[PDB]
DNA sequence: TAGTGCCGGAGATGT
DNA sequence: CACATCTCCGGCACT
């Protein structure tokens, strides 16, 4: 109703003009917030939260671990991975979407 | 070092 | 009373 965080990220991850601060790493559904501050800034404006930052935003993401919606890529900073059936949800395969988005 | 990423508990919050 | 954060926090690990 009032868009969820994992849905927000997907929204960005499927818009070329947002590749500057968030993007697919080419490996399946794993993505990277190259500019966490910019992601958190936009997250903040969406939900109307002037004090939103990555520290908080990431707390939202860790909530998704048990929910098996998004998982953390251990070892790579600002990198996480959608572990849920995004193929059925979006209708595309990682390859198909990457292609469509021109992911390198 | 202190700074920063990252973790997950807990009370607060409400475009 | 639910619910998805939001906010804060003590902790651990790495550089």
UniProtKB/Swiss-Prot annotation:
Helix H4: annotated segments: 86-90
Record feature DNA-binding region, as residue ranges: 3-83
Highest rank taxon of the organism: Eukaryota
Region (Helix H5): 94-100
Effect annotated for changing residue 97 to A: Reduced autoinhibition
Localization annotation: Nucleus; Cytoplasm
Free-text description of this protein's post-translational modifications in UniProt: Ubiquitinated; which induces proteasomal degradation.
Assigned protein family: Belongs to the ETS family.
Assembly and interaction partners: Binds DNA as a homodimer; homodimerization is required for transcription activation. Interacts with MAF and MAFB. Interacts with PAX5; the interaction alters DNA-binding properties. Interacts with DAXX. Interacts with UBE2I. Interacts with SP100; the interaction is direct and modulates ETS1 transcriptional activity.
Role, per record: Transcription factor. Directly controls the expression of cytokine and chemokine genes in a wide variety of different cellular contexts. May control the differentiation, survival and proliferation of lymphoid cells. May also regulate angiogenesis through regulation of expression of genes controlling endothelial cell migration and invasion.
Protein name per its UniProtKB record: Protein C-ets-1
Lineage of the species this protein comes from: Eukaryota, Metazoa, Chordata, Craniata, Vertebrata
């Amino acid at each position: 109703g009032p868009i969820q965080l994992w849905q927000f990220l997907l929204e960005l991850l499927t818009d070329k003009s947002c590749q500057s601060f968030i993007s697919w790493t080419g490996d399946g559904w794993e993505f990277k917030l190259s500019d966490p501050d910019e992601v958190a800034r936009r997250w903040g404006k969406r939900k109307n939260k002037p004090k939103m930052n990555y520290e908080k935003l990431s707390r939202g993401l860790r909530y998704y671990y048990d929910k098996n919606i998004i998982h953390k890529t251990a070892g790579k900073r600002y990198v996480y991975r959608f572990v849920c059936d995004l193929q059925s949800l979006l209708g595309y395969t990682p390859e198909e979407l990457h292609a469509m988005l021109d992911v390198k």
